[PDB]
């Protein structure tokens, strides 16, 4: 077991994948192609779906990312994860699935609440998602979480964790800050996380070494924080401005990097070396035949997972981005977030 190289916090979700007739979508008032949170009546969808013998997969942004890390590091217990689940059957199913993959996990159990679950409904070549977050929102790091984190030097949190409470991400980042060789990495996760948690992020970013995000996320960050994307010069301007939220214009000599994925366009990143100078990185994204692209859901999670894996191996920024691109490219060729040990990238 171990050593654990990467530790992450997130909202754990059990994904249930199955092909269903259109009548199923209509019965639960679902619009094909949309992704939503379950309404009261839609709550009955989960036990109903269990009867379809769905493929059960661990899910949730951060959990998907560490599963990629765990996959690439190979050795059992190479990546750790903490989050909240319920004391229901789904909670045990999720834990067992994670155990099967060799991921080290410590789930806080919230008695009487349901484990996060997402119905991944396949119909007419489209995926319709209906998620019930449940226990995820009650997560609070245990007082001895650092013991679980062992000698990990790479910490990751998604902005989605701010929903339960910004205190979890703040505590993880604070712990990482006290360790010279450790880094804290954050995902912007969604434009609304950027909007809702403006104040919290202001403080958190000053304790962040690597910031991940896509175009829309960075665009809102630039507006919210008045920092200033299909256009390069503009993307660079945004990244350069965002880097200031991490450095405050000072040079601690610690890792300071902002990485912006831009769909098909090249990844753009702005870095401040221990030297104190700013550097702009640009890495093109290898395309795959349109005929292979099956499910784009999880591409971003895979990118971060691959980047973190490469980072744990001491690769250059560009190599980390290249590994992330390769992982994203690999996962979109099948529905649901999963990877096989054969022909792994990076
Ligand atoms: N707020 C969230 N926190 C954690 N996992 C999430 C969240 N929203 C969606 N997910 C999961 O992550 C997948 C997308 O990366 C979704 O299909 C779902 O299973
Ligand atoms: Cl998450
Ligand atoms: Mg540190």
Reported resolution, Å:
1.8
Overall CATH class of domain 2-12+58-115+133-339: alpha beta
Q: Give the HSE-up count for residue 91: Cα atoms under 13 Å, Cβ half-sphere.
A: 20
Q: Which residues surround ligand 2, an ion (CB under 5 A)?
A: 10-11, 60-62, 158, 160
Are 35 and 13 spatial neighbours (Cβ–Cβ below 8 Å)?
Answer: no
Tell me, using a 6 A CB cutoff, whether residue 129 lines ligand 1: yes
Closest CA to 258 of 276, 240, 275, 231: 240
Nearest CA to ligand 1 atom 3: 11
Encode burial over 207-228: b for 16+ CB neighbours within 10 A, e otherwise: bbbbbbbbbebbbbbbebbebe
How many other CB atoms sit within 10 Å of the CB of residue 333? 11
Tell me the fold of 13-57+116-132: Adenosine kinase, small domain (3.30.1110)
Atom of ligand 1 minimally distant from the CA of 59: 19
Say how far apart CA 31 and CA 46 lie, in whole Å. 17
Q: Which ligand is nearest to the CA of 210?
A: 3
* Class of residue 158 by CB neighbours under 10 A (exposed 0-12, middle 13-18, buried 19+): buried
**3 upstream amide cis, omega within 30 of 0:** yes
Q: How far is the CA of 17 from the centre of ligand 1 (A)?
A: 14
Are 257 and 281 spatial neighbours (Cβ–Cβ below 8 Å)?
Answer: no
Adjacent-strand bridge partners of 83: 107
Q: Where do we find the tokens 């209906």? A: 130
Nearest CA to ligand 1 atom 12: 60
Q: Where do we find the tokens 């998602």? A: 129
**How far is residue 271 from each of residues 202, 274, 308, 318, measured CA to CA in Å?**
19, 10, 16, 11
* Class of residue 161 by CB neighbours under 10 A (exposed 0-12, middle 13-18, buried 19+): buried
Helices 198-205, 166-177: axis angle to 10 degrees equals 10
Say how far apart CA 209 and CA 47 lie, in whole Å. 42
In the chain, count of helices (H) and strands (E)? 12, 14
CA 192 distance to own-chain centroid: 15
**Residue ranges of domains in the chain:** 2-12+58-115+133-339, 13-57+116-132
How many other CB atoms sit within 10 Å of the CB of residue 3? 12
Nearest CA to ligand 1 atom 11: 60
Are 12 and 134 spatial neighbours (Cβ–Cβ below 8 Å)?
Answer: no
Rounded to 5°, angle at Cα 55 from 49 and 61: 100
Q: Binding site for Mg(2+): which residues? A: 176, 179, 182
Is 295 catalytic? The answer is no
Q: Where do we find the tokens 């990877």? A: 339
**How far is residue 14 from each of residues 19, 59, 92, 95, measured CA to CA in Å?**
17, 5, 10, 10
Q: How far is the CA of 255 from the centre of ligand 3 (A)?
A: 9
How many other CB atoms sit within 10 Å of the CB of residue 342? 5
Q: How far is the CA of 274 from the centre of ligand 2 (A)?
A: 30
Cα dihedral: 64, 194, 29, 63 (round 10): 10
Atom of ligand 1 minimally distant from the CA of 161: 3
Q: Where do we find the tokens 């962040």? A: 208
Q: Among the options 15, 88, 295, 301, which is catalytic?
A: 301
Residue to mutate, 61, 186, 196, ligand 1, most ligand atoms under 8 Å from C-beta = 61
Tell me, using a 6 A CB cutoff, whether residue 13 lines ligand 1: yes
Nearest CA to ligand 1 atom 6: 60
Rounded to 5°, angle at Cα 138 from 71 and 211: 50
């Amino acid at each position: 077991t171990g050593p654990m190289r990467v530790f992450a916090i997130g909202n754990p979700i059990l994904d249930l994948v199955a092909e269903v007739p259109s009548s199923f979508l209509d019965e639960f008032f679902l619009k094909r192609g949309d992704a939503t949170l379950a309404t009261p009546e839609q709550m009955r969808i989960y036990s109903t779906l269990d009867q379809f013998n769905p493929t059960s997969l661990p899910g949730g942004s951060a959990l998907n990312s560490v599963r990629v890390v765990q996959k690439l590091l190979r050795k059992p217990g190479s990546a750790g994860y903490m989050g909240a689940i319920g004391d229901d059957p789904r909670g045990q199913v999720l834990k067992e699935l994670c155990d099967k993959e060799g991921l080290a996990t410590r789930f806080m159990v919230a008695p009487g609440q349901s484990t996060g679950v997402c119905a991944v409904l396949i119909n007419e070549k489209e995926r319709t998602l209906c998620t019930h977050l449940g226990a995820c929102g009650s997560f609070r790091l245990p007082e001895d979480w650092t013991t679980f984190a062992s000698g990990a030097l790479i910490f990751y949190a998604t902005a989605y964790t701010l929903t339960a409470t910004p205190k979890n991400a703040f505590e993880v980042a604070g712990y990482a800050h006290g360790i010279p060789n450790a880094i804290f990495t954050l995902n912007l996760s969604a434009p609304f996380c950027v909007e809702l948690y403006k104040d919290a992020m202001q403080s958190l970013l000053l304790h962040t070494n690597i910031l991940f995000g896509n175009e829309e996320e960075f665009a809102h960050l630039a507006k919210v924080h008045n920092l200033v994307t299909a256009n390069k010069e503009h993307a660079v301007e945004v990244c350069t401005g965002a880097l200031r939220l991490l450095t405050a214009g000072q040079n601690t000599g610690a890792t300071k990097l902002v990485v912006m994925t831009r769909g098909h366009n090249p990844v753009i990143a702005a870095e401040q070396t221990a030297d104190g100078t700013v550097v702009v990185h640009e890495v093109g994204v290898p395309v795959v035949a349109a005929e292979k692209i099956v499910d784009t859901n999880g591409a971003g999670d895979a990118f971060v997972g691959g980047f973190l894996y490469a980072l744990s191996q001491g690769k250059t920024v560009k190599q980390c981005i290249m590994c992330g691109n390769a992982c994203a490219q690999d996962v979109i060729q099948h529905v649901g977030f999963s990877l096989s040990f054969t022909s792994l990238p990076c």
